[PDB]
A = this chain, B = another copy of it.
Amino acid sequence: DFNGKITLAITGASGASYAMRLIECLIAANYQLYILCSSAGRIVLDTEVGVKIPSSPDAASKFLTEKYQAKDQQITVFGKEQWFSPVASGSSAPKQMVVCPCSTGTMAAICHGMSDNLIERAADVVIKERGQLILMVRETPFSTLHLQNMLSLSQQGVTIMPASPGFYHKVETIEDLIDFMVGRVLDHLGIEQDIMPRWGY
């Protein structure tokens, strides 16, 4: 039925709207989503976009499914230590994962392999199985230690995508900036998108 499974982690960086719009576009492209959200991520979603994701995985899954009028099974949320989840094992996990937005703290944890929660274990799995991990980092300025951590991940095939949208297409609202970034994630995932033209400059 679905076109593929993608793991999506939302962490406590600023940039909630990116994550909300990415999920909208993935659902519309008819992907199945396994969604992980950190406790700080929930705080940011509430403050920035007024979105309150219930803390219980079941209620969260139903909440998101209604928000996006998604199909049966299309969205599943897994809790912070739910090791039964498919994402926890290289024997079962999807091969694509996006962290959006991705805090420098979560980026750091994945860089060093702390694997202390489901989001960090999932990322560690995608890296070991040689899949695709994309981290949409939101911070500025960067410190040298942020850069060392990004460098290490990028050398190992992780895609560091800072939330730094461009303005060279006609930018007429905040949405168009949001769609710049989301369209780049989607191009990287190998998913047809029409939210960001291919005109170039």
A residues contacting B by CB (< 8 A) are 12, 14-17, 39-40, 43-44, 47-48, 81, 83-93, 103-105, 107-109, 111-116, 120-121, 124, 127-130, 134, 137-152, 154-156, 159-169, 171-174, 177, 181, 183-184, 187-188, 196-201
Count identical subunits in the complex.
8
For the complex of A and B, the 5 pairs showing the least CB-CB separation, nearest first, are A89-B200, A105-B115, A92-B200, A108-B113, A14-B166
Judging by beta carbons under 8 Å apart, are A197 and B142 in contact? no
Out of B43, B92, B103, B201, which one reaches A198, CB within 8 Å?
B92
Q: Give, as a whole number of angstroms, the nearest-CB distance from A172 to chain B.
A: 8
Given contacts A105-B121, A166-B14, contact A184 B141 (CB under 8 A): yes
Residues of B within 8 A of A177 (CB): 174, 177
Q: Do A155 and B155 touch across chains, with their CB atoms under 8 A apart?
A: yes
Chain B, residue nearest A127 (CB) = B143
In the assembled complex, the CB of A111 is this many whole angstroms from the nearest CB of chain B, namely 7
Closest B residue, CB atoms, query A137? B164
Q: Say whether A88 contacts B156, CB under 8 Å.
A: no
Residues of B within 8 A of A104 (CB): 113, 115, 124
